[PDB]
């Protein structure tokens, strides 16, 4: 079993305003156990876009079924895209930790551009 890797294969995704953007992400292992989260931006001012664990995110749909024990696909879809959604989106693996989950590894990021 190699070490966990978070793979975002797309440098860029172009979406028309109003359409649905797909952000691809794959984890190459399930060790360690822990949730995947999506952010726009890096650093402390990161916007939480999706969280596998908890929370309500009405614009976001996962491509795959995450409740599958064997799942490694963490791609998401964001509906009703407006120009305010442009930015760089990061797929980040967390590990359970003590009290709260802590960042483990991050994908390289995907830039989202609107109106083609």
């Amino acid at each position, epitope marked *: 079993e190699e070490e966990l890797q978070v793979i975002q294969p797309d*440098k860029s995704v172009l979406v028309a305003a109003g359409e649905t953007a797909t952000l691809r992400c794959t984890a190459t292992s399930l060790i360690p156990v822990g949730p995947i989260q999506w952010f726009r931006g890096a650093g*402390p001012g990161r916007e939480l876009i999706y969280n596998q664990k908890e929370g309500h995110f009405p614009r976001v749909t996962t491509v795959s079924d995450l409740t599958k024990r064997n799942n490694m696909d963490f791609s998401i879809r964001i509906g009703a895209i407006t120009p305010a959604d442009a930015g*760089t989106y990061y797929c980040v693996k967390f590990r359970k930790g003590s009290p709260d989950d802590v960042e483990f590894k991050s994908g*390289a990021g995907t*830039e989202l*551009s609107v109106r083609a």
Partner: antibody
Amino acid sequence: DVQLVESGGGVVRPGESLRLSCAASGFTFSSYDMNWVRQAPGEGLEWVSLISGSGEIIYYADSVKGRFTISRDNSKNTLYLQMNSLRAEDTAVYYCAKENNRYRFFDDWGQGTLVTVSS
Amino acid sequence: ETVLTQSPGTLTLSPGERATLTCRASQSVYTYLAWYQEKPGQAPRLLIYGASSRATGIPDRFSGSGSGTEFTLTISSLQSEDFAVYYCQQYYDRPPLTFGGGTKVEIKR
């Protein structure tokens, strides 16, 4: 091999305009993101702008935002930088750089061309 | 943005010595750090990508290491053509793409 030939640099006055060209050869120009990077005399490397292979994804550095316009012409295998309302701080050697397929680092560079903004 | 700081600005070493150049990021960039070489008067050229991957055609004495916020470019034995300026560049946090300030390797005598 991969080649990037730049041109258009020169001496201009503040507020005037210039146009830089980066003619490519030895690779499929249409499928690579291209960047402009500058280096003021005695200073370090500074990212200026980037344009996707398709030409529709475009970012600028804040210090040039609204004055410079990047574009490409895949039919002529040349990248352009349109510099308008130039300031003294724009004096630099300007390099064109070809990005890696997946990541935003620069695989190949042009020879550079010099822009002097002076009165 | 993410700020990269290279220290020191000038590194003074004798030919054939080991050079160890540092690059520190103000916040984590994981493994998404490149190193460029700039010999006097020439355009920059890529040496290292992905913190540790040697670019095609780059001599073996160049090696990169580190992750997160601390990176190191090592030259095992300095040749004459290695006295130049070296820049690190991160591509995790973008835009903007950001460069370090540069370290110049000068000949000791």
